[PDB]
């Protein structure tokens, strides 16, 4: 299968991410590289990238996916809301039915290691989900400000990546 | 936190650096100044310097770090091998455990923008790592002769500096 994969957020200027026990922008890139590795072990062809500095970063992220035909376009994020010791958990966002197929599979896998918030339809008109040619999903891996979520994530990054890849490819790796 | 920073190499005579798409001695100084700015933005007390001409430049570099107590002493370098279009990447050198703490954090940050060559223990008897009072690291930011490395570096110098500062201070800036 062909997969486009992008890390959410820029590193400076407009578009930077959230921070708590972990830094979203940094971990989006660390986890991307691990997901690429696991996707390739599953036999997929992967087109990955990131945008570190640009006022046009949203369009540039979509251009990474749109440069070539792919079966699915995936963007990695981490969530935020309020600092808590409690588990908060995982959700995967889609806009339309074609992305929902993948969002449900990825969320089912991540829900075995994080609290299940479910696959979720886009309620904020996210540019990534409306400007890619391929079916698109946005993974909110876990909350940067949950101590329980991040305690698990920091010690199991390779497992998080494997589960994402297994959900995308719909198979065990 | 208190940080001592030095730019690698002299500008003439004994001790000059490498050249490729960028000039190491020049960029060590440019990037040093950016790292100082980002470290100060992160709340650190910073002592920096360089040695432009001296046959005794190694001892003089260490004296910049040793003049006052600091938590970590950092020297900036760029790597070299052969001229290539391909990525070559980043590594940070330490001698002992107390520097390894910082080297691993700096390398983890720089590996989100450059190919990851790793935090590495010194097998070459670097004077800088052996003659500093404080824990010490030597950052080989990227390769001067890699077009891919320098293409990113030249366009993102502030981001390179921010990532180094975040690795040293262990927090988001
Ligand atoms: Zn985000
Ligand atoms: Zn050097």
What Rg do the C-alpha atoms of chain A give, in angstroms? Answer: 15
- Whole-angstrom Cα distance, residue B12 to residue B9? 9
Token couple for B94: 């330490």
Which of B105, B138, B116, B135 lies closest to B17 in space, CA to CA?
A: B138
- Whole-angstrom Cα distance, residue B110 to residue B115? 8
- Dmax (CA) of chain B: 42
CB proximity B112 to A under 8 Å: yes
CB proximity A150 to B under 8 Å: no
**DSSP H or E stretch at residue B63:** helix B57-66
Residue A30 with chain B: CB contacts under 8 Å: 108, 111-112
- Whole-angstrom Cα distance, residue A154 to residue A23? 11
Which of B74, B155, B87, B152 lies closest to B115 in space, CA to CA?
A: B87
Q: Which residues contact B156 (CB under 8 A, 6 or more apart)?
A: A52, A53, B113
Contact B120, B112 (CB under 8 A): no
Residue B59: CA count within 13 A, CB half-sphere? 3
A10 to chain B, closest Cα gap in Å: 10
- The parent domain of residue A110 ranges over 2-169
User: DSSP secondary structure string, A24-70?
Assistant: HHHHHHHHHHHHHHHHHHTT-EEEEE--SS-TTHHHHHHHHHHTS--
CATH code for the domain in which residue B118 is found: 3.40.630.40
Contact: B159, A29; criterion CB under 8 Å: no
- Whole-angstrom Cα distance, residue A147 to residue A129? 29
What Rg do the C-alpha atoms of chain B give, in angstroms? Answer: 15
Total domain count, chain A = 1
Which of B152, B163, B172, B150 lies closest to B35 in space, CA to CA?
A: B163
Task: Kindly list the distances between the CA atom of residue A108 and the CA atoms of A89, A100, A115, in Å, as whole numbers in the listed order.
Answer: 12, 12, 11
Resolution of the experimental structure, in angstroms? 1.4
Question: Which residue in chain B has the smallest CA separation from A17?
Answer: B172
Contact A45, A106 (CB under 8 A): no
User: What's chain B's length in residues?
Assistant: 173
Determination technique for this entry: X-ray
């Amino acid at each position: 299968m062909k997969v486009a994969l992008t890390a959410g957020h820029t590193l400076t200027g407009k578009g930077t991410g959230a921070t708590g026990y972990i830094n979203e922008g940094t971990e989006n890139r660390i986890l991307m590289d691990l997901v690429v590795k696991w996707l390739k072990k599953g036999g997929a062809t992967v087109y990955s990238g990131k945008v570190d500095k640009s006022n046009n970063y949203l369009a540039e992220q979509c251009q990474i996916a749109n440069k070539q035909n792919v079966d699915v376009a995936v963007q990695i994020h981490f969530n935020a809301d309020h600092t808590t010791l409690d588990k908060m958990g995982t959700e995967t966002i889609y806009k339309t039915n074609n992305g929902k197929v993948y969002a449900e599979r990825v969320n089912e896998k991540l829900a075995t290691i994080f609290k299940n918030r479910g696959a979720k339809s886009d309620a904020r008109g996210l540019y990534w989900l409306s400007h890619t040619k391929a079916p698109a999903i946005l993974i909110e891996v876990c909350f940067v400000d949950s101590k329980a979520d991040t305690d698990y994530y920091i010690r199991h990054k390779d497992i998080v990546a494997k589960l994402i890849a297994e959900g995308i490819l719909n198979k065990t790796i």
